[PDB]
Amino acid sequence: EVQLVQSGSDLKKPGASVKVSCKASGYTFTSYAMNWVRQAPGQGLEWVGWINTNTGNPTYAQGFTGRFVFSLDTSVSTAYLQISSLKAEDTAVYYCARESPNYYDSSGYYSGYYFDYWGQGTLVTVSSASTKGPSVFPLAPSGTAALGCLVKDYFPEPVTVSWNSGALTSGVHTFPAVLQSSGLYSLSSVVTVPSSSLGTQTYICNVNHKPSNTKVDKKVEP
Amino acid sequence: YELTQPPSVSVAPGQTATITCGGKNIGSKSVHWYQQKPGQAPVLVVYDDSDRPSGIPERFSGSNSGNTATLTISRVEAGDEADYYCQVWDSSSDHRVFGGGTKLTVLGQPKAAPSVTLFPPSSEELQANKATLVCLISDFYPGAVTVAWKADSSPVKAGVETTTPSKQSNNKYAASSYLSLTPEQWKSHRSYSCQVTHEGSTVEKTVAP
Ligand SMILES: C[As](C)(=O)[O-]
């Protein structure tokens, strides 16, 4: 039962370095090659290179020469990926994958080489942004009316939005965040309500940004 | 060595999808196929042109001859909706190469035009010497949209930030776009428009200072 298990998400500043781990189990680590593949967000798979698990000798794809380093710790059946002088374009999910046939199989030349088992992936985020709590703004409605709230310029993800402390759930679209060129996030939540904006039919959005201890209750009025 | 794949393939459920992978003398190489469902890691679905790893259904097949390799998927289910990638090993360079990938869409519902909501800057934001126009886009199918902003008929490219579409609980998509301006820029025009193009049709909304 082959398993490849990767280290968790990592957030790094431009210029820094990352080390990503890949622990193998359920097979002879030193009998199979380990490959590394990159996937930038919303893009295709890109082969980074392979490492010989018996010698430690790495082979890099074109352009993955210089800042990418493969290494091993065979005693703990673990393979490492290191990326130095990080740039914002290094923001990607990194997968490790076992390759078949193995080193000692004579069928390799004609039948090789495919990635039969993959790790779950490690997201490496490269950003110059610091922790920042958001500003929350009411989005006033102009037989139904839409009202909402804008959760502006925070870092990092996540934030949660609820309406009237949870008591309001029907007609609620909470939209995924946008990443701005500043490196900060923004999102909106909108509620469609029957046009009964009673002088006191209160609509409050509850915003939580846990990484900055932000909790905001905003009344949304016509 | 280059592998060329069509970016997009659409299929009616129960019908058969065909995904091609072109390469000079690809027939002389072993071709493998990976299925990647959203938010998940790739899974090997076909290796050595036509073999299936254990657990992969008989509906998945492949062929490889001359300059084209093909992944065929019979009686397509909603569960088959994913990105498919082909891969080869090059004995000359000792590289493994991936094609650019094909998004497979299983058309499980009719075309739905986006519903668009446009909000002007709030009083609170204007007080903090800032101005954001919020364009909320929902319930569109298929999951692809283009957004353009307009001021006094002119195209606005600066200060625009748009999300990728996202699958909602119903099987429709949502997206949003934000236009950041200074309070003076906001007040300097008669109206601002958010224009959302979906399958060649534009849904437009206007807001005025
Ligand atoms: C039907 As809806 C809540 O996605 O506008």
- Boundaries of every domain in chain B: 1-108, 109-209
Q: A62 CB contacts (<8 Å, ≥6 apart)?
A: B95
Are both B1-108 and B109-209 of the same fold? yes
Chain B residues lying within 8 Å of A148, measured CB to CB: 119, 134, 136
The alpha carbon of residue B129 and the mean position of all alpha carbons in its chain are separated, in whole angstroms, by 36
Q: Are B5 and B36 in contact (CB under 8 A)?
A: no
Q: What's the CATH number where A156 sits?
A: 2.60.40.10
Report the first-to-last Cα separation within chain A, whole angstroms.
60
A180 touches B at CB < 8 Å: yes
AA identity, residue A161? V
Beta strands per DSSP E along chain B: 8-11, 17-22, 32-36, 43-46, 60-65, 68-73, 82-90, 95-98, 102-106, 115-119, 131-140, 146-151, 154-156, 160-162, 166-167, 173-181, 192-198, 201-207
Q: Using CB atoms within 10 A of its CB, is residue A189 exposed (0-12), middle (13-18) or buried (19+)?
A: buried
A113 touches B at CB < 8 Å: yes
The token pair at B46 is 């076909």
Tell me whether strands A10-12 and A122-126 are parallel, antiparallel or unpaired.
parallel
Same domain, A105 and A159: no
B39 three-class SS = coil
Which residue has a Cα nearest atom 2 of ligand 1? B139
Q: Are A108 and B90 in contact (CB under 8 A)?
A: no
Same domain, A7 and A97: yes
Question: What is the count of structural domains for chain A?
Answer: 2
Q: Which residue, A65, A94, A128, sits at the end of a domain?
A: A128
For residue B139, CA distances in Å to A215, B94, B117, B165, B169 come to 30, 47, 12, 10, 10
Same domain, A161 and A216: yes
Chain A residues lying within 8 Å of B163, measured CB to CB: 175-178
Same domain, A61 and A118: yes
Report the first-to-last Cα separation within chain B, whole angstroms.
56
Backbone angles phi, psi at A122, to 5 degrees: -125, 115
Q: Are B183 and B131 in contact (CB under 8 A)?
A: yes
Q: B34 CB contacts (<8 Å, ≥6 apart)?
A: A45, A115, B42, B43, B44, B45, B84, B85, B86, B87
- DSSP class of A33: -
Residue length of chain A? 222
Tell me whether strands A92-100 and B82-90 are parallel, antiparallel or unpaired.
unpaired
Same domain, A109 and A152: no
The token pair at B189 is 């025009």
Contact B125 A173 (CB under 8 A): no
Same domain, A90 and A193: no
Q: Which residue, A68, A94, A128, sits at the end of a domain?
A: A128
Burial B71-99 (b: 16+ CB within 10 A, else e): bebeebeeebbbbbbbbbbeeeeebbbbb
Neighbours of A184 (CB within 10 A): 19
Q: A55 CB contacts (<8 Å, ≥6 apart)?
A: none
**Alpha carbon of B174 to ligand 1 centroid (Å):** 9
Q: Which residue, A128, A154, A174, sits at the end of a domain?
A: A128
| CA angle, B179 then B184 then B190, to 5° | 75
Q: Residue A150 is nearest to which of B48, B99, B132, comparing CB atoms?
A: B132
Same domain, A8 and A116: yes
> What CATH class does B109-209 carry?
mainly beta
The token pair at B179 is 């236009």
A176 touches B at CB < 8 Å: yes
Q: Using CB atoms within 10 A of its CB, is residue B106 exposed (0-12), middle (13-18) or buried (19+)?
A: buried
Same domain, A94 and A53: yes
Tell me whether strands A58-60 and A122-126 are parallel, antiparallel or unpaired.
unpaired
Backbone angles phi, psi at A29, to 5 degrees: -45, -45
Same domain, A86 and A160: no
Strand partners, A21: A80
Same domain, A120 and A141: no
Strand partners, A219: A204
A10 touches B at CB < 8 Å: no
From the list B135, B108, B109, B105, the residue with the least C-alpha distance to B120 is: B135
Query: Does an H or E element contain A59, and which?
Result: strand A58-60
Residue of A nearest to B126 (CA): A137
The alpha carbon of residue A83 and the mean position of all alpha carbons in its chain are separated, in whole angstroms, by 17
Residue for token pair 């790495």? A58
Q: Is the peptide bond before A158 cis (omega within 30 degrees of 0)?
A: yes
The token pair at B58 is 């008989």
The token pair at A63 is 């352009």
Using CB distances shorter than 6 Å, the residues near ligand 1 are A 173; B 115, 138-139, 168, 170
- Domain ranges, residue A108: 1-128
Q: In whole angstroms, what is the distance from residue A14 CA to residue A17 CA?
A: 9
Q: B101 CB contacts (<8 Å, ≥6 apart)?
A: A44, A45, B5, B7, B36, B83, B84, B85
Chain B residues lying within 8 Å of A181, measured CB to CB: 161
Is domain B1-108 given the CATH code 3.50.50.60 in the classification?
A: no
The token pair at B205 is 């909304």
Same domain, A14 and A100: yes
**Alpha carbon of A144 to ligand 1 centroid (Å):** 13
Q: Residue A47 is nearest to which of B97, B119, B132, comparing CB atoms?
A: B97
Q: Using CB atoms within 10 A of its CB, is residue A166 exposed (0-12), middle (13-18) or buried (19+)?
A: exposed
Which residue has a Cα nearest atom 1 of ligand 1? B139
AA identity, residue B111? K
Mutation probe of ligand 1 site: the residue of A144, A169, A173, A174 with most atoms within 8 A of C-beta: A173
Strand partners, A188: A150
Tell me whether strands A46-51 and A58-60 are parallel, antiparallel or unpaired.
antiparallel
Tell me whether strands B8-11 and B102-106 are parallel, antiparallel or unpaired.
parallel
Same domain, A115 and A179: no
Question: What number does the ligand 1 atom closest to the CA of B168 have?
Answer: 4
Q: Are B91 and A109 in contact (CB under 8 A)?
A: yes
- DSSP alpha helix (H) spans, chain B: 123-127, 183-187
